[PDB]
Amino acid sequence: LAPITAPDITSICKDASSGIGNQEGAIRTRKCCPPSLGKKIKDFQFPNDKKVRMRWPAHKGTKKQVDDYRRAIAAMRALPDDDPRSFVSQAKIHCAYCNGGYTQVDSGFPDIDIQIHNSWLFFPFHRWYLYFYERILGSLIDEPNFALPYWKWDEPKGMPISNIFLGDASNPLYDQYRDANHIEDRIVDLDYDGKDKDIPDQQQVACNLSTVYRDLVRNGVDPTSFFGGKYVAGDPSVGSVEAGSHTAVHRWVGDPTQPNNEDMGNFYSAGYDPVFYIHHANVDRMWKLWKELRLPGHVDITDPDWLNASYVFYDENKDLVRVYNKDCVNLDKLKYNFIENSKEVFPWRNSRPPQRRKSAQVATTGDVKTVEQTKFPVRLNQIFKVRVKRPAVNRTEEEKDQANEVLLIKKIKYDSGKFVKFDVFVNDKLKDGVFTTPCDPEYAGGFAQIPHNDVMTSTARFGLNELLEDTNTEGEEYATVTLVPRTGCEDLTVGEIKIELVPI
Numbered sequence: 001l002a003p004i005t006a007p008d009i010t011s012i013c014k015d016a017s018s019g020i021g022n023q024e025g026a027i028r029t030r031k032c033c034p035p036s037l038g039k040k041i042k043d044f045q046f047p048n049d050k051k052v053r054m055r056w057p058a059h060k061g062t063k064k065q066v067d068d069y070r071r072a073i074a075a076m077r078a079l080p081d082d083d084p085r086s087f088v089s090q091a092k093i094h095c096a097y098c099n100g101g102y103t104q105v106d107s108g109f110p111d112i113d114i115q116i117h118n119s120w121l122f123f124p125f126h127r128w129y130l131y132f133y134e135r136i137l138g139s140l141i142d143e144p145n146f147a148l149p150y151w152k153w154d155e156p157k158g159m160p161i162s163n164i165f166l167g168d169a170s171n172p173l174y175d176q177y178r179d180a181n182h183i184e185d186r187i188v189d190l191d192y193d194g195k196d197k198d199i200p201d202q203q204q205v206a207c208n209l210s211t212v213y214r215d216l217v218r219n220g221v222d223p224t225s226f227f228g229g230k231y232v233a234g235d236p237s238v239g240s241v242e243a244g245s246h247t248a249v250h251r252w253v254g255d256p257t258q259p260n261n262e263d264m265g266n267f268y269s270a271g272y273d274p275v276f277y278i279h280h281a282n283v284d285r286m287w288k289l290w291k292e293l294r295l296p297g298h299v300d301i302t303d304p305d306w307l308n309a310s311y312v313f314y315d316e317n318k319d320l321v322r323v324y325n326k327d328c329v330n331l332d333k334l335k336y337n338f339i340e341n342s343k344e345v346f347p348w349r350n351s352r353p354p355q356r357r358k359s360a361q362v363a364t365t366g367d368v369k370t371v372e373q374t375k376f377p378v379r380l381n382q383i384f385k386v387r388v389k390r391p392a393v394n395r396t397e398e399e400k401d402q403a404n405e406v407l408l409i410k411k412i413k414y415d416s417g418k419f420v421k422f423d424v425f426v427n428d429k430l431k432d433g434v435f436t437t438p439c440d441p442e443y444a445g446g447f448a449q450i451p452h453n454d455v456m457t458s459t460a461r462f463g464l465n466e467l468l469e470d471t472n473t474e475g476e477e478y479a480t481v482t483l484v485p486r487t488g489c490e491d492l493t494v495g496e497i498k499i500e501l502v503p504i
């Protein structure tokens with residue numbers, strides 16, 4: 001039993017020095033430590049709120065919902081910086097936990113930093129972060145049933161940044177450090193890679209819906225693939241949402257003219273944009289949706305090493321509270337939820353990529369070497385293709401409902417002072433001139449990483465059960481994998497590639 005355990009963050013904290021590629025010229029401070037007020041850390045107790053806080057889509061809020069949120073942020077902004085509830089203090093929380101503020105001294109490892117990103121800590125940490133943030137906002141405006149908006153980018157009209165965030169500084173929800181090309185009611189790109197795609201809005205919307213389906217169904221096949229990999233004291237694959245739509249939105253909003261793409265483009269500065277929290281409000285919602293799908297494998301983590309991991313936050317009373325992963329899995333107990341559509345289906349539920357026609361494919365993926373014929377590690381300074389032996393062919397619906405076939409891209413090594421991304425295509429073999437889109441069945445997804453240099457070693461998982469059917473290759477002994485670099489890959493290597501059956 002070695003769960004990650006935040007220390008007394010008011011006693012053990014150091015300036016952020018990780019994940020910031022240009023510190024000598026950074027727009028926000030790296031002094032992200034919380035105010036030390038001599039408080040004793042209290043244990044969490046479940047809230048006694050009379051009713052459930054209902055978070056609302058940011059593009060369809062009532063007059064009261066918008067006005068309160070706006071009034072709450074104005075109040076938080078007006079607080080002294082040193083106040084732990086202040087706008088600046090709340091932003092620094094993200095910086096402290098994401099950019100090397102804390103050590104694992106409480107677990108007996110004072111020389112190792114805690115990183116809550118790129119692991120199974122990703123979802124529960126942000127859930128707790130928002131929990132206290134929301135309760136703090138409500139107390140500032142004397143609204144005990146106050147609820148955050150959420151950026152519903154899984155809904156077409158929810159996809160552009162909501163106009164409540166736009167205008168100028170006289171709007172509390174406004175932030176000057178945003179990509180000026182992306183704040184004019186333009187549609188978010190949930191698989192953004194730094195380059196604006198010149199495609200019709202209709203197509204971008206369709207692909208955004210496919211991205212949600214991908215993150216929650218095609219690649220989010222089990223707790224490891226969805227939440228992220230196991231992370232314990234003394235020491236991690238990234239999850240489908242985290243390296244997918246979540247990372248895209250950060251890079252899409254951040255200002256590319258700033259040294260570290262501040263604010264949303266980097267973890268240390270993200271919290272200075274009010275939309276950061278509202279984006280994460282929807283990421284929090286994805287966890288709930290993922291469970292509501294009631295598909296095999298869509299279950300919560302039961303590992304004691306996860307359940308007993310804990311963080312510390314200031315609450316609405318400036319008290320320090322220790323919270324555990326085990327206590328945030330049930331929203332009803334945290335006295336909040338999300339206003340849903342009350343319809344038969346999610347708009348993205350059937351956004352599985354269309355089936356590929358055999359008449360659109362040639363016979364083979366071409367002349368390409370197998371893994372065993374290849375010498376690893378392989379440099380990704382150019383497109384890379386290899387055939388990977390599958391554990392079996394022509395599995396029945398029974399076997400597919402018992403085990404996912406999973407593509408593992410292991411030992412991804414690269415300089416993580418810059419945003420990195422490459423894309424993964426499997427069994428791409430179209431006839432010349434065949435019509436293509438950014439969300440074709442061949443596309444397995446991507447590996448994207450916001451800067452987190454402690455140089456760094458990652459792992460990515462892609463589900464193939466649907467894909468092999470969608471591309472008519474469930475009977476081929478090998479899967480041809482194509483890795484395609486988009487940015488920050490000029491020095492990236494890939495140590496191992498393989499496909500495994502992973503029981504549900």
Ligand SMILES: [Cu+2]
Nearest residue numbers: 094098117267
């Ligand atoms: Cu974060």
Ligand SMILES: [Cu+2]
Nearest residue numbers: 246250270280
């Ligand atoms: Cu984030």
Ligand SMILES: [W+6]
Nearest residue numbers: 199200201202
């Ligand atoms: W158009």
